[PDB]
Amino acid sequence: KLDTMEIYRIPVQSGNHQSSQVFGFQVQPGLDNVFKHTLLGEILNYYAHWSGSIKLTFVFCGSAMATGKFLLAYAPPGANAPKSRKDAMLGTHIIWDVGLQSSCVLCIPWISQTHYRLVQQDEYTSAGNVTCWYQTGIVVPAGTPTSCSIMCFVSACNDFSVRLLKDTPFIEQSALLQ
Amino acid sequence: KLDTMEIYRIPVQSGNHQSSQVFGFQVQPGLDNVFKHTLLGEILNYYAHWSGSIKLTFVFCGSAMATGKFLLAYAPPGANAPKSRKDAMLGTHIIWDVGLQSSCVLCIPWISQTHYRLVQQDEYTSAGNVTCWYQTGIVVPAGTPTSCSIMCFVSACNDFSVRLLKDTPFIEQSALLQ
Amino acid sequence: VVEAVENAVARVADTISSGPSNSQAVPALTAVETGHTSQVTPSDTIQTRHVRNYHSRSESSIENFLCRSACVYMGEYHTTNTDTSKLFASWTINARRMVQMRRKLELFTYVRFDMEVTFVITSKQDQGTQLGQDMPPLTHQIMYIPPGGPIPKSVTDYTWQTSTNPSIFWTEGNAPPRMSIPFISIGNAYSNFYDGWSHFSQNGVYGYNTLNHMGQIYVRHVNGSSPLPMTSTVRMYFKPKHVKVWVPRPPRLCQYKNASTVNFTPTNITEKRQSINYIPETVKP
Amino acid sequence: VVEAVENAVARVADTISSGPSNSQAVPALTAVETGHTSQVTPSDTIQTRHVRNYHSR
Amino acid sequence: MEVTFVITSKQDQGTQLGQDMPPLTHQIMYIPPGGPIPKSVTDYTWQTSTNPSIFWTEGNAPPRMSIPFISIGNAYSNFYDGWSHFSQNGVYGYNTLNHMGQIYVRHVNGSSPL
Amino acid sequence: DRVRSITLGNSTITTQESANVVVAYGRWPEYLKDNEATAEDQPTQPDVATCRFYTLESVTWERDSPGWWWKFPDALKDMGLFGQNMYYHYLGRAGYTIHVQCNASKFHQGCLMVVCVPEAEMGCSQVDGTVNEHSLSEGETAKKFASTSTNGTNTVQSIVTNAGMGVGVGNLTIFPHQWINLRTNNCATIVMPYINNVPMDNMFRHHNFTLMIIPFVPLDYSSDSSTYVPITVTVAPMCAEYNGLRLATSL
Amino acid sequence: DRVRSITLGNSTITTQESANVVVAYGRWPEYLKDNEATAEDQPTQPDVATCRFYTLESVTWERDSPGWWWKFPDALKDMGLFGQNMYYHYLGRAGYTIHVQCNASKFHQGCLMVVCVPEAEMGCSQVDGTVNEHSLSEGETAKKFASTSTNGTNTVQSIVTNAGMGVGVGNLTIFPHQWINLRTNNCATIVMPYINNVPMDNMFRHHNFTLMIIPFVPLDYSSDSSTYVPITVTVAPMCAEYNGLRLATSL
Amino acid sequence: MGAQVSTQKTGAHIIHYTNINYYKDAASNSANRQDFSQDPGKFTEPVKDIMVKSLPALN
Amino acid sequence: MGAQVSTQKTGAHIIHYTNINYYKDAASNSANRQDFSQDPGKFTEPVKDIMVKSLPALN
Ligand SMILES: CCCCCCCCCCCCC/C=C/[C@H](O)[C@H](N)CO
Ligand SMILES: CCCCCCCCCCCCC/C=C/[C@H](O)[C@H](N)CO
């Protein structure tokens, strides 16, 4: 799926799927494959140090007759990633209710022992993980498609900053005239 | 005619010659063979960029008993040069009536998308063309020469300027002591 | 102490807004027989909008036009030869041998300025069968001789004592030498053209060489060395400053022939085209 | 003559202290269809302490 | 803009080595569009009467000079979604708009049997 | 007193031998006011792309020439943006400045009448018939008056003495007019306002006025004087307005 | 808060399910001022004959549709008097209001991105080659993005993920844009000012901006819901100015 | 003598410097490294009607 | 100490510089690049009687 639009959609559906996890990834805004080629990631790869809070916005793109609620959770470093909704509910989380407003924001706050983290993150400057779970499930009437998709947007807050300029590893040539 | 005074005269005559065009040339004050060795052209060939309005003065040098009227027209770039008086009348023009005052001025105004044009003009910085046509024709009594000539003078207006000094391509040597 | 000096910026004229007209004012009708050039603007012949023009005529002033360095002379000289006249270079001072600067100067009849002079000296090895030696840095001497001073006969002549003549000593690998010269002429301004003679009987020498008389330059190697011969070339560059010029002239059309005269071969006025109506078509699919 | 030129330093925003809430204000509900990016900070979604931030961009 | 040049030299691989060479001098000339073009290293055009040039010799600091904003437009253009001819053909894209001259560089010594 | 200059848009006319300027009935052209309008949509006013001098093609004045006429509008329907604004709208309105040029030497003689006739309705050479529009107008080319009575079908009865309207040609001085007398002047100028019984009208359907050029004293000259003497017309619209934008009509 | 009305010239658009209006960079269109002009002749300003909504032809959103693009100007060169004023002048200048409509029922789903990209320079499917203008634009007809890598000569490399520009398609949100989410709204509106490095320009030679419509979530529906779902674009120029009147060019 | 004195970049929790211009053209001056302005609303909030952020976006 | 401070050449739509003279002769000073005067009427209008430009040239 690396060259199709399907790379951007998160799948959800109706029925009893509470034991299944929706999505999960690490918080490495310049290192993880999930974040490295976005606007924020592309700007961070010119620098060595970063600091600040990060905004993730989620938009539901199903029919107007579908209903559901989700749990969005962020866990700080120090443990392994949660394996169930009961574990994930213990960290920083929000419960999203789908309705006339289509979008919900999960704000990841700066919780760190150092003032800055490395753009090339190691185990010492790790930042945690994010996971999503069904809070109730998706309910639809007859005559509607069962499967739906969710999309996710990333951006930086107003306390964000970077330092220590460097060259980026994403562009390269083997000879002049290129 | 490149080494005679005939190079300076524009020929006109009496009779039915309305379908014939009098003269026409491009507006390239430092590039065209028509303008490059005049005072204005010689000054412009020391520079790379020019801007401003241009004055063309026309003087009728026939007998005192000859009468006539001419149409002097300037067309902006974007189309081919006009092939008839009806096409030429649609651009910027003036109707010259020959009389006790001998001279008429056609002012070419600065109409350009950029602030400056190149002295070495290309298709991107083209400036248009100028053409002349019979508005009525030349009428003379008996005992007068039929053929007459017109002369044209060029100069720059008070909004004109140049920049980016360079060496001129009109002078050269093959060894010292020259 | 500090003194504030004000600089007036000079921009071109704005064009004013103009509307339709029907009257007896005829700005476009003139007469060139008077020797007068018409002062008409676009706003006198068409309808115009108001434009605020910020363009400046700063790079077309005489000082910015003439204040650049140009080559005026190049010459060669050896360290070892069998002629003893090729061991030093010498020439008479003028600006008539390189055509670019001299055509630029001849746009005016009279000129007055100070000068900045720079020299660029290079050396090279003469082609021999056996190569290989280490040579110490070379030193060069440049002497200016005003008219009437004694003339060197060799590279060991007493005249290089330079007791009163100004000289420059220089060694290779450093910045190029430079010095400034004031306005030195027995007249009130320099003359680029002289339509006259040297003798009162209307004969003798005609034209420019009658009036210049500004001395000579001599250049030599100081080391007096080099069992294997070397060759140096010297180039001289002029740069005028604090300029004033009078009586403009039409630019030179024909090519130059020699440095003394204004002699020329007849040339055309321009190149030809097809006919008096010819237009190149450029809008074609 | 000497002229003193002033340079304004520009730092990032401080985070303010925030407590529990139960109301009709919904800062976390938005709509991306408008083309607008949400201006929400951590103090709108969790409880925060006051921090004086000295970082500069 | 601020422009800097870094020039280095080296010996060409030959069977017989060994010679002492004096310091080398280099000339850099900038030619704005429309100026004459050199044909060789002894062409008259290196007179540089009106073109700006730099003369430099090896072993010194690298040469440097500053250039103002030189474009017939109000700002430089990195992308141009257009053509050069009014018939919507010809040259497409960036090369239509730049036209900022050329650089020529030579040795001044005219030397070096090796 | 004889020199004149007229500027409109990006065009200018100079003259050194003018008589004066005729303003048709003492009224200069102007835009439509609010207490005289009936159409409700906002009108367009191009104001320099349409209000400028356009030159037609010239005619040759010969020793036996009866005269010429043009119809306005429909002589400017292929002229730049004036013609394009004519093709896309239902209603238009404009005044005009007309300038006729004809020069000759002090050894020539002749006299021309230049007259503008509003609502010049013409008759057919067959009295039991009707006219068509090709016989009335050829755009920028002139129609030619005749020397005798005309016959055949579909042509306009064009003997000069009746001016093709059933009147005496010597009475046409009731309309706005001037004379070109070759010993006196070399140009005529008339400024015409909008004249109609309704405030706006369709410009393809209705000819607002006809321009007539009729020589009363023929052209004469002697042994080796110039024989070719042309006449040239130049017209500029003024205070041009359009209403009722839709797709372009096709003739 | 969801109802909106926009009037320009003699045209009006109503909507009952709008999100908001995007003003490209906080700047509304306006006319050129005197201390920023370089061309000296008086410009023409038609002001209601050109500044009005023109509708292009519609496309069909299918279950597997990659997306569409248009180029502006050159998509309005045959639209009324805007196109005619484009053909007779050398320089033009205008801002725009864009309005995209697509409605569907509460049992459909899908999401579209509507984005305006200034100076969208595109690449050829042959890397050792150059593009031509037919592959860039078809006037009022849309070009179609592709589903995989394209090949053959003279066609544009149009796989949707790279947007034909060598970028990531998910980053196009840096430009002015909106979304049409079928459960939320049914129209998008963008107001674009004049954006260029020179104050005026020729409208046949230079494409000022490209309009892209790209579905991120495909269209889906069930048993007997409507299958035909069209998308429609409507564009209105604003503060339109022209300079340099001559004879009409011919493509 | 046309000297400018301005503050140096320091930390937080004697500190100024002097500059003289030597050349006639402003293109010869050194870079302007100490100007820090921002206007993000041009790219993040380009909407006609204002959005309060505590109110719903629609309705 | 005999310092001159004057404005630099800039654009339109901190900007001054300092100079000291080091030598005893004025021929050693740098060029005067910032003097912009004009008098074109000397070459374009060298006539005894004034010509108004809205009036005829003769008669
Ligand atoms: C040895 C150190 C000093 C080097 C000697 C250089 C002095 C040169 C004499 C100054 C002459 C400059 C003025 C001469 C140029 C001509 O007048 C111009 N071609 C115009 O007449
Ligand atoms: C010989 C001494 C002077 C050396 C000549 C250097 C002058 C170079 C010309 C200045 C060009 C700088 C601006 C050009 C860069 C492009 O615009 C950028 N890629 C963005 O368009």
XYZ file of C-alpha atoms in Angstrom, chain C residues 35-39, chain I residues 40-48 50-51:
16
model
C 16.927 72.627 -33.897
C 14.638 71.927 -30.927
C 13.639 68.480 -29.631
C 10.002 68.016 -28.632
C 9.235 67.641 -24.920
C 19.210 68.309 -20.382
C 17.802 71.603 -21.691
C 21.344 72.579 -22.660
C 21.250 70.036 -25.511
C 17.541 69.542 -26.273
C 16.213 73.138 -26.093
C 19.031 75.477 -27.169
C 16.820 78.173 -28.701
C 16.647 81.912 -28.098
C 10.901 79.875 -25.678
C 8.599 77.248 -27.197
